[PDB]
Write a protein that binds this ligand. Structure first.
Ligand code: HEM
Ligand code: HEM
Ligand code: HEM
Ligand code: HEM
Lengths: 140, 136, 140, 136
């Protein structure tokens, strides 16, 4: 589902994210918390901004996972299996939240990347879409 | 939102002539099975009962039906209670109301026409909005 | 992701729908047109009610495809490929509509079926979701 | 909708101090690539130009900002146009506004903070609701 050209772009974005997972992830979550206040209900934090320590720790786990998924595109179903069960069977996070964070990750990259063409935007969106698909596959 | 007399009547009449407590009880159970993640909030309350909860939910809806033009003001506290106290993901609100529509459909059968479904959809949309308002 | 138990319920439900595809399908579309008016934008009909001749023909095409998908549940991806190419490359129907119609099919089944317990609902909801994901897979 | 003093300025100052016609032209091009099905409305319009259409789209938004207090009333005719004459799927409206936000973020880089994004998010929410009102 990923042309050879999309994997190259995905491969470029993953290296930018891997440099500062806490900072990037924290910004992604802060945007999600502002635009969709309902998603805050899963976290018991005192600070919901990107400056929060808890937000940065969680944001770090989230972004590193994306980086790894970008590494395992040829088999996202098998690579993401464990995280899906954790979300679907243990955390029980409403899957409707996944696509909302995807859009916030996209806005975050747009404010940081030097080049974020519609072509690059499309490849990233397709990767985030596939990850959201896998993360909601083991709820029922 | 503006209500026509027909919509007011459909909603008010159903609440006075249908056993909404049973309908909501079955809607909750349906919800826990089709959308398992919603169990999150109750697996912790050891003595939780669908029957009792439904009664508490229908008591609020019954109230919304009486002040249909000011559901936002009426549910202000209920909304704050769900956001700050219970920490219920507002995205889950429609999962319950959607299940109530399925139970109403199952109960009224061919009498639950697309037009009638539209009235209930509209009503639940107003209720979801009122109860999701105080989420900051 | 379909157990043998969900396979039997699905096949049992595909049997019921096959009896009168047009009637069930017409009702499904009428509920969609009432609850999500924006979806009327794809059809140039004069009558958007269950009695409309054009709604009946389309409703029938939709349900027959559902019945056939229920029969090829073991290979949904290769089976719905042609149908996926049609919506994504020719009809260009916004994918956000698929899940909307799925809920109306569920409501339609509840008003007809003698028994529509949470378990049957879940099995049916799982099939429609799988069908919706295949139908949204060839847009970009 | 009640707009704080902070939001009113953020929105108006931008339409004032920024080249919004270029932002929406790129937003349109971005939407056509990321969400390919939105191209269907222009596949038969032989003389279509992204930059021309954008000036027209920005025109309505500028008018919405001038009347930020009652966009719903202002957009009534425009909404009927999209619903009855143009037959545009209302569920596609946010695909363009979402792309406008991506262009604003790419433009303001680190100045497009989560809080600032929330302002624009609420604004386009009000605009999408206003342009979708007359779909019956
Ligand atoms: C779409 C991208 C997402 C990815 C890749 C992702 C990734 C992760 C990872 C790697 C963990 C830690 C796994 C572990 O330690 O076992 C985690 C934890 C968690 N995730 Fe997700 N997640 C995503 C979206 C979401 C969303 C949108 C929410 C809700 C708004 C959410 C809520 C949680 C919660 C509550 C935890 C537990 C954190 C804790 O208790 O410390 N996740 N996620
Ligand atoms: C949309 C219709 C809903 C209405 C009108 C409603 C109404 C109520 C009311 C009136 C209460 C009692 C308030 C109090 O304790 O003082 C309550 C409690 C609660 N609600 Fe909601 N609710 C709705 C949906 C939901 C949903 C979908 C969930 C989550 C899946 C939820 C979870 C809870 C929980 C966890 C409690 C407290 C449980 C307990 O104390 O036994 N509610 N709700
Ligand atoms: C359960 C999901 C759906 C199924 C199984 C389905 C199935 C079909 C089938 C079998 C056809 C006939 C294709 C052909 O002529 O070769 C079709 C056509 C079409 N579908 Fe879908 N469809 C679904 C959802 C939707 C939705 C939600 C919309 C839009 C609101 C939509 C809009 C169309 C349109 C515009 C056509 C063309 C109608 C015509 O040729 O007269 N479909 N669909
Ligand atoms: C919410 C943002 C939008 C605004 C403010 C907006 C505004 C406008 C305005 C002012 C017109 C002119 C109406 C007239 O003829 O008097 C128009 C035309 C049109 N709009 Fe929208 N629109 C928006 C989004 C969309 C989207 C997302 C699409 C579809 C992808 C769309 C498709 C069209 C089409 C097809 C025309 C006709 C243009 C032509 O004839 O070349 N609009 N819109």
């Amino acid at each position: 589902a990923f042309t050879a050209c999309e994997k190259q772009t995905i491969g470029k974005i993953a290296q930018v994210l891997a440099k500062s997972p806490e900072a990037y992830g924290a910004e992604c979550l802060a945007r999600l918390f502002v635009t969709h206040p309902g998603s805050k209900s899963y976290f018991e934090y005192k600070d919901y901004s990107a400056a929060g320590a808890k937000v940065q720790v969680h944001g770090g786990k989230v972004i590193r996972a994306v980086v790894k998924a970008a590494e395992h595109v040829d088999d996202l179903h098998s690579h993401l299996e464990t995280l899906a069960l954790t979300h679907g069977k243990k955390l029980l996070v409403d899957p409707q939240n996944f696509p909302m964070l995807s859009e916030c990750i996209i806005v975050t990259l747009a404010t940081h990347l030097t080049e974020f063409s519609p072509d690059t935007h499309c490849a990233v969106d397709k990767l985030l879409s596939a990850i959201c698909q896998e993360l909601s596959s083991r709820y029922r | 939102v503006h209500w026509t007399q027909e919509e007011r009547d459909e909603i008010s009449k159903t609440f006075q002539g249908t056993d909404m407590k049973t309908v909501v009880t079955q809607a909750l159970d349906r919800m826990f099975k089709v959308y398992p993640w919603t169990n999150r909030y109750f697996q912790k309350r050891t003595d939780f009962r669908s029957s009792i909860h439904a009664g508490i939910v229908v008591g609020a809806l019954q109230d919304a039906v009486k002040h249909m033009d000011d559901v936002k003001t009426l549910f202000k506290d209920l909304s704050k209670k769900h956001a700050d106290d219970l920490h219920v993901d507002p995205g889950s609100f429609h999962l319950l109301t959607d299940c109530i529509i399925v139970e109403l459909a199952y109960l009224r059968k061919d009498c639950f026409t697309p037009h009638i479904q539209g009235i209930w959809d509209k009503f639940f949309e107003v209720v979801i909005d009122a109860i999701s308002k105080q989420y900051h």
